[PDB]
Copies of this chain bind each other. A is one copy, B any other.
Amino acid sequence: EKYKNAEKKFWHPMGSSAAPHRDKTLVIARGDGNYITDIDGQRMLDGVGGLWNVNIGHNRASVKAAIAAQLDELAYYQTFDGIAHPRVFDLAERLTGMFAQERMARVLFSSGGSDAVETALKMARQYWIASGEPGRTRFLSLRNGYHGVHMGGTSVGGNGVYHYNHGQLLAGCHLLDTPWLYRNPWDCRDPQALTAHCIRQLEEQIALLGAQTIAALIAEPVQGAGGVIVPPADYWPRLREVCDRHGILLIADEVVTGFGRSGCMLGSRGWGVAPDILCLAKGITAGYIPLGATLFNQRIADAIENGQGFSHMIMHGYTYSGHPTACAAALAVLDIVEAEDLPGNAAKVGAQLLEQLQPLVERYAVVGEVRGKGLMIALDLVSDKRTRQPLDPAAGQPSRIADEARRAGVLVRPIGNKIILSPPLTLTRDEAGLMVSALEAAFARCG
């Protein structure tokens, strides 16, 4: 196959479009199980899980059969006002049943995580208007938080790299510090003291703005793309409490943590917390078909459906909201997740994997720390152990380590100064050891 010399007419998301870098490509040809093979026939463990989303593994027959079945019946029809089809009923009933613990009542379907976030922001605005409180407009989010790249979700993202090239977006969006033990304004390495600092900052910000102007707070139960930041255990419970003091809606961004990666069917549930809104994508279809979903609890659902006048008009949604093929594939994916206890496998093998990575910290100066929860882990590379200053990605050392890991048979993901591990949730003890061995080799080479 001659894709090696092929000219590139598309743009890589999240990469330099400048030559000559633009012309480098790792071209993946085939995937099966938790392994992928490039156009050069070299095979590597898929330590990134696609983009933490191929959580059941590549080429699952049952899911492929579900898609084929639905295509023969009805690949697509719309669900706009008064029209629907069987598959959207099935998954909406299914999703609300799985998250009854969070009193979720209604689903607004979409095609991806940014859709789910964009939907959560605009519908949070609608909830307050239907409740007779149109002053509730502002949004809170956390540093290093990532919520997609639609303009709404871009506006609440806590990493500047996604902002710089696009100008002023939504006004009235405010950032809070994240409870990050490795790097935080207080140099605080104690979890209870760090949670308390962050919550006190949150109350002060709420008071300054006036709670009556704030529509929602959005947060990832484990911050993924920002560097696998695992908050302290009491942070999310005290998040829920503070939002309740002011009636502020709590949006859990579960796009990455949804359906098991961190050890629980929800990251918010894993912390013992019921948010007001759930945002889901990625693993929901295990990447097989684009699908996103935003779930709303009974509180929000009741207000909007009883809203007066135009406030009960839901003028938001997508041509492919509730896509029959997408739903069909989703149902098959959820069956595997529950049947094979993929949340349980993630909690077990992830801990084992995290344990095996700790000696890297002592062995290699460039390894600052290794953190994780379930099967999301980040290796934080620093230039200085004492000050925890990140490596500069422009020097290119993190991708060089990544390349050598790949040559050793395991694809992992550099983001800035951090190597992300996010394999399928079916990862075994054996494969977890393979990942350990390849990173050890990469740091011996390029550490």
Contacts and interface: CB of A to CB of B under 8 A. Distances in A.
B122 A149 contact: yes
A383 interface: no
Interface stretch (A128-136, A264-272, A433-441): A128-136
B17 A319 contact: no
B10 A109 contact: yes
A200 interface: yes
B112 A319 contact: yes
Nearest to A207: B160
A345 B204 CA distance: 39
A19 interface: yes
Given A137-B167, A288-B71, A160 B210 contact: yes
A350 to B, nearest CB: 21
**How many copies of this chain sit in the oligomeric assembly?**
4
A142 to B, nearest CB: 12
A209 B80 CA distance: 24
A63 B325 CA distance: 13
A161 B319 contact: no
Interface residues of A, number: 146
Contacts of A166: 122, 125-126, 129, 316
B289 A81 contact: no
Contacts of A93: 6-7, 9
A233 interface: no
B164 A25 contact: no
A215 B169 CA distance: 14
Interface in A112-147: 112-115, 118, 121-122, 125-126, 129-130, 133-135, 137, 143
A209 B326 CA distance: 36
Contacts of A323: 290
Nearest to A152: B151
A310 B96 CA distance: 40
A325 B19 contact: no
Given A86-B39, A290-B290, A9 B151 contact: no
Given A125-B165, A289-B290, A76 B54 contact: yes
A72 to B, nearest CB: 7
Contacts of A209: 160, 163
A74 B10 contact: no
B59 A10 contact: no
Contact of A58 (B17, B26, B74): B74
A73 interface: yes
Interface string A28-45: 111100001001000000
A359 interface: no
A282 interface: yes
Given A31-B74, A171-B168, A185-B197, A17 B304 contact: yes
A314 B10 CA distance: 12
Among A96, A170, A207, A315, the most chain B Cβ lie within 10 Å of the Cβ of A315
A15 B18 CA distance: 44
21 contacts: A8-B92, A9-B89, A11-B108, A12-B79, A13-B317, A13-B321, A17-B305, A29-B86, A31-B74, A58-B75, A64-B72, A68-B68, A82-B399, A113-B319, A115-B150, A118-B151, A125-B166, A134-B135, A167-B215, A185-B185, A186-B186
